[PDB]
Structure 1
Amino acid sequence: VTVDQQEILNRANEVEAPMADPPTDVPITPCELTAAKNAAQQLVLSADNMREYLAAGAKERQRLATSLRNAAKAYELTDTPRVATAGEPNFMDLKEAARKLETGDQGASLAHFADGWNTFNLTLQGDVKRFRGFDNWEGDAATACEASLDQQRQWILHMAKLSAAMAKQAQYVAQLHVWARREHPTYEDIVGLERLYAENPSARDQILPVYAEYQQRSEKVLTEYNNKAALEPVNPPKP
């Protein structure tokens, strides 16, 4: 049962000092498709809960610092909800699908989101020295505090890992959207083809198979998008 009261107090300050700020970028849907919107809703929830749990972690480190100081004198959190996602694609017609896909920021906010959460991952996990054991504080109280610090340390690294996973979900949805724009017939081309059909009556039997292929392309894209955009909630552990 050795003590150094100076160390206890210094470590109290070190432990509750501000950690990296989590980003507050709001990820917006890349386009007007339901599957895109539901992805954004899921990210909003996951990221709100991450920030709420990170605020609870700051409380925990304050509470450790208070506990360290009260020693030296002597000498509501829930799961991230899952957003409902459509079981079946729902094939709207060509033009409306193309309009929905082409209306919105096309993934720009998702890149910014990912970038913020990625930086927070990388930086937060290099601020764990604050949870090391003591040099000259020994006994049961010291051992208890060391356990508690090590629990916070492990929780921080887990939070950093979940931050990386969430940023990747956002990148994944941005990639998906880019893929969907590359593959889906453009609004302008659908209108062009409808125009070609209207204006060329004798060509209409040659145009019909082309239009049917535009429809198969669209459906194929909407089926992928509906399926691949459904995200898992990010569910952090309690500190």
Structure 2
Amino acid sequence: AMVTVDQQEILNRANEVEAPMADPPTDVPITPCELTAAKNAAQQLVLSADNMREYLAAGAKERQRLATSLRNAAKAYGEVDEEAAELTDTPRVATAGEPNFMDLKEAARKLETGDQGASLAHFADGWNTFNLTLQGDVKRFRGFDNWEGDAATACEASLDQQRQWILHMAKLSAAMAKQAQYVAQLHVWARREHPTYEDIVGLERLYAENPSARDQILPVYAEYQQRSEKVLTEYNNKAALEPVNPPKP
């Protein structure tokens, strides 16, 4: 292809491509409650978010490397001119062993103790906002106006791949935010459906104190036990989050 070069345009675009992007958020996702499933979901998010940040750092390095390439091209056009005169996957938090049933009071105490998903929601807000930030940070990968030919085209192909990488990272930012929101919603659902500590207390106290009530109260206690088991089983299932494994830049 017939070559056109604007050396200054190349140098400008080098500066532009490596200009800082906003840093990802650092909110720590805290477990919504004391259940092992809730703790495991929050740990899985910590690990996924850490790896996302490490991959985002590697992306910044790649933008620096592309800037250097462009500056080396700019220089080489000047030379000919003169002469003519460690990234890995995210660990999976093991969820095996989580109890699907428990003493009632213990299960209710664990569900009721903790921030109930406030931290998870804040985590999701930051990563959602980062998704939109990244989407706004791709003009730097556009084509050239006055650099044409094979080198320009090769550069444009690299720029295109970095654009696609950023947008894939934006999608994963949104996906990981959705995981946190999903576990927060799961937790609110579990509170709606699991018997409360105090409801369980009241029933057990009446049972203990009133022998003639026991035969007729027991089915209420059994319904509570059974509903508790269903809720804990579903919490264990649904809180198991897939690790986020970003693409290498």
TM-score range, shorter chain: over 0.9
Is the 2:4–2:148 contact (alpha carbons within 8 Å) kept by the matching residues of 1? Answer: yes
What's the Cα RMSD here? 1.1
Q: Deviations over 1:21-66 (max 9, x none)?
A: 2111110110011111111111111111111000000000011111
Deviates further, 7-16 or 83-92: 83-92
Equivalent residue in structure 1 for 2:141, among 131, 149, 152? 131
Secondary structure at the counterpart of residue 20 of structure 1 = coil
8 Å CA contact 1:35, 1:86 repeated in 2: no
- Is contact 2:21-2:137 (8 Å) kept? yes
User: Which has the larger Rg?
Assistant: 2
Q: Is the 8 A contact 2:36 2:98 kept in 1?
A: no
What is the alpha-carbon distance in structure 2 between the residues aligned to residue 219 and residue 27 of structure 1? 26
* CA displacement at 1:88 relative to structure 2: 6.2
CA distance in 2, matches of 1:234, 1:44: 10
Q: Give the fraction of aligned pairs with identical amino acids, expressed as a percent.
A: 100
Deviation track 1:105-133 (CA, whole Å, cap 9, x = no partner) reads 11000000000000011121121110011
Between the aligned partners of 2:135 and 2:99, the Cα distance in structure 1 is 40
- How many pairs are equivalent? 239
Residues 48-57 or 89-98, more deviating = 89-98
The range that moved more, 38-47 or 68-77, is: 68-77
Contact 2:43 2:93 in 1 (8 A): yes
Helix, strand or coil: the match of 2:53? helix
Matches of 2:229 and 2:100, distance apart in 1: 9
Runs of 4+ in 1 over 6 A off after TM superposition: none
Could you tell me whether the CA contact under 8 Å between 2:87 and 2:248 is conserved in 1?
A: yes
Shift of 1:139: 2.4
Query: Any conservation in 2 of the 1:2–1:138 contact (CA below 8 Å)?
Result: yes
Does structure 1 conserve the Cα–Cα contact (< 8 Å) formed by 2:194 and 2:231? yes
Instruction: Tell me if the contact between 2:45 and 2:180 (Cα under 8 Å) persists in the aligned partners.
Output: yes
The CA deviation at 1:86 is: 2.3
Contact map agreement 1:176 1:229 (CA 8 A) in 2? yes
Indicate if the aligned counterparts of 1:159 and 1:236 stay in contact, CA closer than 8 A: yes
Deviation (angstroms), 1:70: 1.7
Distance (whole Å) between structure 2 residues aligned to residue 224 and residue 116 of structure 1: 27
Which deviates more, 28-37 or 191-200? 191-200
Q: CA deviation at 1:87?
A: 5.9
Shift of 1:20: 2.5
Q: Superposition pairs for residues 69-218 of structure 1, below 5 Å?
A: 69-75=71-77, 76-86=86-96, 89-218=99-228
Counterparts of 2:163 and 2:187, CA distance in 1 = 37
Shift of 1:208: 1.0
Listed one character per residue, the Cα deviations across residues 92-111 of structure 1 (whole Å, up to 9, x for unaligned) are: 11010011111111100000
Tell me the distance in 2 between the aligned counterparts of 1:83 and 1:174: 18
Equivalent-residue separation in structure 1 for 2:90 and 2:76 (angstroms): 41
Contact in 2 for aligned 1:31/1:105 (Cα 8 Å): yes
* Distance in 2 (alpha carbons) for counterparts of 1:113 and 1:24: 8
